[PDB]
Amino acid sequence: ESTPIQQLLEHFLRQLQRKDPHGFFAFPVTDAIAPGYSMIIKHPMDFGTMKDKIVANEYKSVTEFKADFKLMCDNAMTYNRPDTVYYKLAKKILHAGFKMMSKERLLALKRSMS
Numbered sequence: 601e602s603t604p605i606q607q608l609l610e611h612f613l614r615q616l617q618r619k620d621p622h623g624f625f626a627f628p629v630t631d632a633i634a635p636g637y638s639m640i641i642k643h644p645m646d647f648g649t650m651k652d653k654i655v656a657n658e659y660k661s662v663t664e665f666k667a668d669f670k671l672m673c674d675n676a677m678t679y680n681r682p683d684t685v686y687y688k689l690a691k692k693i694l695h696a697g698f699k700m701m702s703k704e705r706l707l708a709l710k711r712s713m714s
């Protein structure tokens with residue numbers, strides 16, 4: 601049975617995943633496909649890793665989940681040059697996700713749950 605934090609973060613996760621219809625953030629980037637990746641990016645992150653943390657009930661807060669989401673986007677904006685599809689999408693998704701997960705929207709949602 602889903603815990604309250606699992607419900608909440610799964611909700612956000614699925615909203616965020618719909619901003620990425622080609623699945624460029626669905627699973628991890630690797631050196632095989634992105635030369636130098638693990639030398640440049642210390643803490644890699646992707647929606648699939650976030651999903652496993654939720655399914656495992658390993659998140660302690662919405663803050664932590666937001667910190668992973670931001671990590672994923674910051675990694676994409678660090679590794680990839682401004683000119684690329686991945687940089688530009690990371691930027692839209694980042695802006696979109698912080699709006700979707702604002703304090704007020706989170707407050708409205710937590711009130712209606714329990």
Ligand SMILES: COc1cc([C@H](C)O)c(OC)cc1-c1cc(C(C)=O)n2ccccc12
Nearest residue numbers: 622623624625627628629633634676680686
């Ligand atoms: C690893 O995520 C990707 C997945 C796919 C397909 C949908 O499987 C993909 O196809 C063009 C690209 C990426 C991908 C994602 C990223 C990112 C997010 O940095 N990236 C950087 C350099 C080269 C590829 C990628």
